[PDB]
Every structure is written in C-alpha cells, then in structure tokens.
Amino acid sequence: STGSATTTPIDSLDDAYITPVQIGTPAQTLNLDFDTGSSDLWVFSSETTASEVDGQTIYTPSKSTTAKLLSGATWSISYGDGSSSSGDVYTDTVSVGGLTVTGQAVESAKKVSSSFTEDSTIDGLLGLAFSTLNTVSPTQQKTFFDNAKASLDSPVFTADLGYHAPGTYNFGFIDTTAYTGSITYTAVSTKQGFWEWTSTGYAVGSGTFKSTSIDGIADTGTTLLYLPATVVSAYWAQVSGAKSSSSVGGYVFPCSATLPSFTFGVGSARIVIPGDYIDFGPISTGSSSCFGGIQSSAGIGINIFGDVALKAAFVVFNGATTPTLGFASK
Numbered sequence: 062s063t064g065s066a067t068t069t070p071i072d073s074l075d076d077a078y079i080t081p082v083q084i085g086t087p088a089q090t091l092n093l094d095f096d097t098g099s100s101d102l103w104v105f106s107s108e109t110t111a112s113e114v115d116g117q118t119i120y121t122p123s124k125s126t127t128a129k130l131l132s133g134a135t136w137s138i139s140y141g142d143g144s145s146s147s148g149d150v151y152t153d154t155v156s157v158g159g160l161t162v163t164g165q166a167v168e169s170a171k172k173v174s175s176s177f178t179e180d181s182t183i184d185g186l187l188g189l190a191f192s193t194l195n196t197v198s199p200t201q202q203k204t205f206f207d208n209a210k211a212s213l214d215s216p217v218f219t220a221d222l223g224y225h226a227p228g229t230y231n232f233g234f235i236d237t238t239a240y241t242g243s244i245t246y247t248a249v250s251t252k253q254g255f256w257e258w259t260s261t262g263y264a265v266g267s268g269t270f271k272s273t274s275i276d277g278i279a280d281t282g283t284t285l286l287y288l289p290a291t292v293v294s295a296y297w298a299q300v301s302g303a304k305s306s307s308s309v310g311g312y313v314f315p316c317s318a319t320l321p322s323f324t325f326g327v328g329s330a331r332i333v334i335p336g337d338y339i340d341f342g343p344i345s346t347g348s349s350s351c352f353g354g355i356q357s358s359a360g361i362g363i364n365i366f367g368d369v370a371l372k373a374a375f376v377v378f379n380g381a382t383t384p385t386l387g388f389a390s391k
C-alpha cells in the first residue's frame with residue numbers, strides 16, 4: 062500500500078504545515094501538523110476544555126462507530142517551544158492520503174496550552190518520530206507510520222514541504238519525479254528517538270564550505286533552523302545590520318536586507334537554502350525589523366533541521382530495520 066497527501070503552509074510565513082487526516086467512521090477530517098520530532102497523534106476533541114478551543118475542528122469519538130476508549134490510558138506531552146497538551150486515548154481508524162491504519166491510537170486532548178488554542182489552523186499533531194517517544198501511559202502506543210509500515214510497498218515516508226506553496230507527504234514510495242539529481246542517504250541514530258543524523262558542514266552564501274560535523278534532527282514540527290552559535294554567528298555576520306536581540310529572542314535583521322543562502326552538507330552532497338527562506342517577517346506588525354529563520358541552538362541541547370532546512374529538500378525517512386535519512390535537491 063501507499064498514501065499521498067498534500068501539505069499546506071498555515072500562513073504566509075510557512076510557520077507550520079497542515080495535512081488532512083481522516084479519523085473514525087464516518088470519517089472526521091482534521092488538519093494535522095505532521096511532526097517528525099515527536100511521536101504522539103493527538104487531536105482537539107469534544108473532550109477539550111471549551112475555553113481552550115477557538116476555531117479548530119474537533120474529533121468527537123462518540124460519533125465514530127469504530128472508536129474504542131483505551132482503558133486507563135492517558136497522555137501528556139510538552140514541546141520545546143513551551144507548549145503542551147494532555148488527555149485520554151481512543152483507538153480508531155486513521156487514513157492519510159488513501160493509506161488506512163485500523164486500531165491507531167488517537168490521543169484526545171482534554172487540555173491544550175495557549176499556543177495551540179491560539180492557532181485555529183492546527184487541529185492536532187501526527188507524530189512521525191520513533192515510537193519509543195510516545196507518551197501514552199501505562200502502555201505506550203505506536204505511531205501511524207509504525208502501524209502502517211509492514212503494509213507499505215516500502216517502509217518509508219517522504220516530506221516535500223513547499224516554500225510559500227503546497228507540498229506532499231508520501232507513504233510507502235519514493236516519487237522519483239519530485240526531486241532533481243540523486244538522493245544522498247546518511248546514517249541515523251535513534252538513541253534519542255529522533256531522526257538524528259550528522260551534517261558534514263555548511264556554507265554561507267557563496268562562501269567556502271566549512272567541513273564540520275553537526276549532529277542534529279530532521280524535525281518537520283519545528284519551524285526554524287537551530288544550529289550551533291558559532292555557525293549562526295557566521296551566517297548573520299553576512300547580513301548588514303543584523304543583531305541578536307535579547308528582548309526579541311534571537312537574531313533579527315533589517316527587513317530591507319537581501320539575505321544570503323545557507324548550504325548544509327549531507328555526505329558529499331549539498332542542500333542550498335535560498336536566502337528568502339530565512340526571512341520570517343516583521344517582529345511585530347508594522348516593524349521594519351524582521352525575525353531570522355536561523356537561530357542558535359545553544360539553549361536547546363540539540364541542533365534542529367526544522368522546516369527552514371527541510372523545505373529546501375526532498376527528504377526520505379527510511380524506516381527499514383536500520384533507519385536512514387535521504388536528502389535530494391528539488
């Protein structure tokens with residue numbers, strides 16, 4: 062089997078991407094944030110505290126004839142932006158782009174934090190990191206990908222995120238028309254439950270490539286590119302007037318600037334992030350200071366190849382017995 066679904070930026074800045082997902086019988090279609098950095102499939106629901114729902118589409122398990130409460134199971138998750146959510150658990154049928162999993166754990170939110178409430182475009186998350194990170198207790202549950210994997214033509218999914226444009230998540234096959242050149246594969250460590258890999262280095266604009274190992278994660282659920290302070294300083298030094306602003310919370314730059322590209326290494330291959338992908342617009346409405354899309358990972362503890370980086374590539378998440386990651390230009 063295979064599945065294929067279009068993923069769409071939630072706003073004009075590509076702050077996140079949503080992908081329609083069918084849950085239950087009859088189907089309830091929710092727009093979920095596919096997140097290769099976490100491992101819970103959770104949704105706004107008829108159980109979510111009413112004051113914490115503001116425009117999202119909800120899952121109502123009592124209207125799904127295939128929903129079953131998972132007895133005694135709860136979940137609770139926190140994300141690196143300070144957000145969180147928690148609730149109870151159903152199993153139900155979940156389909157993405159024509160690929161169907163029966164008995165998927167669907168984590169129904171009873172509580173969500175303010176950032177989730179304030180984002181009316183995101184009805185929940187679909188985690189695509191390794192199932193070892195799933196938060197359901199007392200019996201951990203499997204991700205959608207893990208449940209689908211044995212039925213897929215090939216045990217893979219691909220992320221093709223657009224810049225200011227739709228894109229695609231495919232399950233079970235590699236669309237050889239969706240990229241240019243070849244796919245370079247690189248080793249993955251699952252020891253932290255992430256799609257963790259080592260980039261071979263970077264370049265800023267037309268500058269010389271610096272060969273240096275950068276361990277980080279391929280994370281579709283994080284917007285920005287978070288890299289070591291030395292690397293980020295080298296990037297912003299090429300943008301006249303850019304500064305790290307403690308009040309704003311990272312590097313900002315004059316909105317009139319033209320940003321240089323940023324290249325990262327995948328083995329001997331190179332992925333070029335165009336400068337425009339690094340512009341996240343005015344820091345507040347009407348300001349002429351703009352937020353940068355490359356920020357220091359110093360306070361995180363891991364480097365994160367978020368959407369800024371991934372959207373410059375066609376990315377293969379290879380879930381074979383020894384997982385690997387593939388990157389191609391596109």
Ligand SMILES: O[C@H]1CNCC[C@@H]1n1cc(-c2ccccn2)nn1
Binds near residue numbers: 139141142283
């Ligand atoms: O949410 C976490 C889920 N697992 C992978 C890492 C990810 N992540 C995101 C951030 C972060 C940090 C600062 C500002 C915004 N996001 N830190 N970790």
Ligand SMILES: O[C@H]1CNCC[C@@H]1n1cc(-c2ccccn2)nn1
Binds near residue numbers: 076077142283285341
């Ligand atoms: O990574 C993202 C995962 N979904 C929740 C918001 C989170 N997020 C975004 C930003 C951000 C975006 C643009 C400019 C400055 N900050 N910080 N955290």
